[PDB]
Amino acid sequence: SMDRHIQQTNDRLQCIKQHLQNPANFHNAATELLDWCGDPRAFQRPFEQSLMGCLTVVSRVAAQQGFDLDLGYRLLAVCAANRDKFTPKSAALLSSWCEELGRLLLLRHQ
């Protein structure tokens, strides 16, 4: 059940947000978040602010040295696929951040 302890899920997402900032924890934290975004119930308004906070960090750090760019990109791609569940401003940000990570990922493979 997802909505019986909403504060707990937001606290978990805020912890994940903090750990995504650290290259030593990004792999586990971004994996946690990708797994969580694979549950279709994750895309609901009570979680959206915390989720956007996580994704904001991913947009910033994924292409930095010591971070896993492809995992970041795969995570942003799932959220971009669900972007119509977010506010219009957030949906536009997701699309932008996903595309930018994809460009960076392409450049490394060229």
XYZ file of C-alpha atoms in Angstrom:
110
model
C 0.000 0.000 0.000
C 1.429 3.440 -1.028
C -0.816 6.093 0.630
C -1.081 4.786 4.202
C 2.097 6.552 5.336
C 2.769 9.313 2.801
C 5.250 11.024 5.140
C 7.360 7.890 5.218
C 7.653 7.740 1.463
C 8.518 11.447 1.257
C 11.150 10.998 3.999
C 12.632 8.076 1.998
C 12.714 10.160 -1.187
C 14.435 13.049 0.704
C 17.081 10.576 1.937
C 17.598 9.342 -1.604
C 17.922 13.002 -2.745
C 20.755 13.562 -0.285
C 22.631 10.405 -1.358
C 22.359 11.109 -5.061
C 24.735 14.044 -4.496
C 27.605 11.749 -3.472
C 29.503 9.779 -6.217
C 30.086 6.897 -3.749
C 26.306 6.519 -3.142
C 24.847 7.506 -6.553
C 24.745 3.966 -7.906
C 22.614 2.616 -5.028
C 20.476 5.799 -4.679
C 19.730 6.092 -8.426
C 18.962 2.363 -8.554
C 16.544 2.754 -5.640
C 14.879 5.581 -7.529
C 14.687 3.736 -10.841
C 13.113 0.749 -9.081
C 10.648 3.011 -7.367
C 9.710 4.757 -10.689
C 8.966 1.288 -12.151
C 5.902 1.060 -9.868
C 3.109 2.885 -11.674
C 1.687 4.095 -8.320
C 4.820 6.254 -7.797
C 3.493 8.901 -10.158
C 1.059 10.670 -7.864
C 0.831 14.190 -6.609
C 1.653 13.466 -2.900
C 5.148 12.346 -3.978
C 5.783 14.710 -6.838
C 7.678 17.482 -5.030
C 10.091 15.036 -3.427
C 10.498 13.173 -6.672
C 11.260 16.362 -8.584
C 13.857 17.236 -5.927
C 15.586 13.852 -6.603
C 15.400 14.304 -10.369
C 16.777 17.806 -10.062
C 19.916 16.351 -8.439
C 20.129 13.643 -11.095
C 19.958 16.312 -13.883
C 22.922 18.086 -12.206
C 25.229 15.229 -11.206
C 24.717 12.341 -13.711
C 27.309 13.639 -16.215
C 29.841 14.663 -13.592
C 33.000 12.707 -13.087
C 32.419 9.705 -10.834
C 28.711 9.491 -11.482
C 26.913 6.945 -13.770
C 25.558 8.897 -16.703
C 23.678 6.023 -18.360
C 21.823 5.121 -15.090
C 20.894 8.774 -14.654
C 19.632 8.905 -18.190
C 17.574 5.727 -17.834
C 16.002 7.097 -14.715
C 15.111 10.422 -16.362
C 13.726 8.518 -19.373
C 11.176 6.626 -17.305
C 10.068 9.897 -15.687
C 9.935 11.677 -18.992
C 7.658 8.853 -20.217
C 5.313 9.750 -17.405
C 5.784 13.531 -17.680
C 2.084 14.180 -18.397
C 1.418 13.165 -14.759
C 3.413 16.164 -13.528
C 2.757 19.870 -13.607
C 3.318 21.428 -16.962
C 6.473 23.330 -15.768
C 7.910 20.110 -14.284
C 7.037 18.116 -17.343
C 9.025 20.610 -19.487
C 11.957 20.375 -17.096
C 11.959 16.533 -17.214
C 11.961 16.572 -21.014
C 14.806 19.091 -21.033
C 16.946 17.227 -18.429
C 16.409 13.861 -20.112
C 17.363 15.208 -23.514
C 20.496 16.865 -22.137
C 21.673 13.743 -20.444
C 21.009 11.819 -23.684
C 23.153 14.306 -25.692
C 25.978 13.933 -23.200
C 25.654 10.156 -23.334
C 25.752 10.228 -27.143
C 28.881 12.400 -27.173
C 30.755 9.829 -25.071
C 29.929 7.095 -27.541
C 31.016 9.158 -30.617
